Amino acid sequence: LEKMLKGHASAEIEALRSQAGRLKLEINQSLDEAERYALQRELFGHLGHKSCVQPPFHCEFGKTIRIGDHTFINMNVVMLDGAPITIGDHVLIGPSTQFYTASHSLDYRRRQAWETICKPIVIEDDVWIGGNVVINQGVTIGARSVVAANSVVNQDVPPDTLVGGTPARILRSLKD
Amino acid sequence: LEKMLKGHASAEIEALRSQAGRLKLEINQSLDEAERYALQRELFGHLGHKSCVQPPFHCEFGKTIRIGDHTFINMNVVMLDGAPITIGDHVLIGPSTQFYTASHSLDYRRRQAWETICKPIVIEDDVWIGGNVVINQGVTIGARSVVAANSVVNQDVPPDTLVGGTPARILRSLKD
């Protein structure tokens, strides 16, 4: 699991993946706000104070996900979490957003064993991510930035910036 | 809940949101067409005759959603329903479509309390909405119009019109 958090069907992994399957299902079935938050704190690497993740929520590992304080994640979010996904404070994430830590080689022979490479995703403080957005590997979204609904983010986004479209392009500066 | 249906963690609201969590889960788990339709009529503001909503279906409040007659909504649809969402008769909605009544201010200080503003969405009669479409706040789609799969609709769409792309642009007139 350490060749993987560093971006290369293991024993540890298949247990951790199977634990997450258990907890996800339990969370997505929980009708109780407190019990979900509780279960989620057992799924996630870290889930901050006054923070909230709406079900159904999907990921593979859980423990690679760290979520800060007063951040809200809306329903139906998918996170391919083979590499760390770090989300700061006061972050808003709209529904059906996708985080793809994983990806593969172009060459089909380099794919027959399902070799995944993973690069972490970082969402800094006070960021608003629109519904239906995709964020691919290695992306950092800088503090106080906005990603418009349905964008696909392939490159790092500077702080105090608005971005939209697909690929995402910088629409305007939110600097004072 | 009235400062909100008018587009500004309340008592009523947290009950209505918690009721919807209950019913959604029950609907999405129901293997019985009649019992789903029954449960859905208890979730929704209104669900018309010969109308059909395929599970899993996701929303927050339920009671702000009014669906007309002979309309079909395919599976995995998400509706952020803080403001009314009104859907007419003979409407077809493809799977994984998103309705976002909610949104936020650009300014990150105007977002720390998760203040949402909500504007209603209206889908008139005989409209066909493609799979994977996003419809943002305040949008009306006029009667007999078509929205192509994967479009993102930000502005009102006239009747008898075909629209596609992202942002949606008017592709051709379906007027006789």
Add this chain to the structure above:
Amino acid sequence: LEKMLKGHASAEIEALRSQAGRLKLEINQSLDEAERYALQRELFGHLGHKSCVQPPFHCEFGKTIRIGDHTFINMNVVMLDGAPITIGDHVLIGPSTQFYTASHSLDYRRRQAWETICKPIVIEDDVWIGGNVVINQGVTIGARSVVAANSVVNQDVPPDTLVGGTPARILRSLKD
């Protein structure tokens, strides 16, 4: 059901659709890798050896879906399977991908009875499909091709080819 696999509320159909509702729910609730694979082999037309479909997975009929060997389908995939969907060997499909076998007529009068037309989708061997992709009717993706995350594929994609954007356009040749 034969006017339909050939691309036009029946008895057979409503049973087969209702069986799939049963099995889907059972699969998406299964915490056991072996039991899912088992249940999935009962849902699908064919599910090959060393092949893997991650829950939750959504479709309508199940029996029209044939999946080859060593292919991996990630979570939250939706398949409108009124016409055959044929997926080869060593295929990778990213999460939240959509296959739309179904579609409708532009004309709203040609839609009041929810008449669907269906055209099959074929994904050949060694193809990698990115997360969040839409594939519409009648599309074949040729062997060893790559479809970048979030593309919408409307036309056939030649083998040894990389495609991306929406509509998908051919980005580069993966021929040796």
